[PDB]
Amino acid sequence: GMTILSDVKALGQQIWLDNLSRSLVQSGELAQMLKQGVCGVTSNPAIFQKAFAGDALYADEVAALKRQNLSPKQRYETMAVADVRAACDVCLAEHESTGGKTGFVSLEVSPELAKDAQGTVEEARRLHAAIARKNAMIKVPATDAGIDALETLVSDGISVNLTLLFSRAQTLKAYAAYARGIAKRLAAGQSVAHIQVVASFFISRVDSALDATLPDRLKGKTAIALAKAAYQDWEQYFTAPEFAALEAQGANRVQLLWASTGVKNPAYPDTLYVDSLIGVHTVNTVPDATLKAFIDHGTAKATLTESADEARARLAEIAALGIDVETLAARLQEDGLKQFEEAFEKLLAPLV
């Protein structure tokens, strides 16, 4: 039942909604969710493409914006920033109640900037200022350029959702860049306690890529094993003396956020990813149908750290089979960027 969301909070994990639309906010539904245990919102270009295509409340907004001399990208941004700002207002009470630790809404920069660090910094600063809310996170793909940009944006005091992570190595690079930006701010005497970063590590895409050619004992197990190993890396990185020296001064840890947690293979229970990845100091962002499934028949248990030994053994067998998870991660990130760009171009076309 609905109290499972509160039960999961007690285990140290926030559950966010992986969807955003003008009607979700305007109808009052998002505000009711924030009272009933949803703790934040994520968007991406595919989410907006579907929202703009299907939500009736955009029609008048598009007609108004087509009366102005604006590029399709600025039409999109005016609509998207307005939804994000309205959602931030709904989530603000929650955000402020925890000292700025919860109640975030994420807006992703243009996919065409993914390999341009300076362009990414420029757009992220601009969108941060345009939303004008302390609980907005700018979402930035975790390419090498994105990790460069992350260090700068953190140095600038901006909260970031680093997305399209599939790699434990790349995630550790992101932690190091975060720590460099935090260290810069502390050395300059600037505040850090309100800077929040999440590392959105994708789940279902890994199993979708590998399962058809895996042996039976491994089907539907790789993504969870990778996530469990990533969380052990996280514990080790953030408790080490180097980060402890920063956390003593007010720095917040990065938190892992499980994304792509809707189950895509009907051979697996629809709550598989949410049930399997609950642990302290994490987030899981879920599409509506997965949130519904988890409320109905999910289980709140501290599963993320269970059986870490078996996770390691499975990842060792994945390597034994010749699957290089780092090569896979790069390919999955590249594919996700192409897919997001496809969705973005599809949403721009009706805005010309």
Side-chain angles (χ1 to χ4, degrees), residues 66-107:
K66 283 183 175 192
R67 292 173 182 271
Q68 295 175 58
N69 296 310
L70 300 175
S71 64
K73 170 178 165 144
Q74 177 133 91
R75 293 192 176 122
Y76 147 79
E77 276 187 0
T78 300
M79 295 158 75
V81 166
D83 291 343
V84 170
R85 189 182 56 235
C88 282
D89 285 336
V90 162
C91 296
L92 192 63
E94 165 65 39
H95 177 81
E96 283 174 348
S97 76
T98 65
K101 298 182 194 322
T102 61
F104 286 95
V105 180
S106 293
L107 178 64

Side-chain angles (χ1 to χ4, degrees), residues 24-35:
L24 171 71
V25 182
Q26 170 72 20
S27 62
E29 289 193 359
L30 184 66
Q32 191 48 250
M33 289 177 182
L34 269 283
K35 293 181 62 182

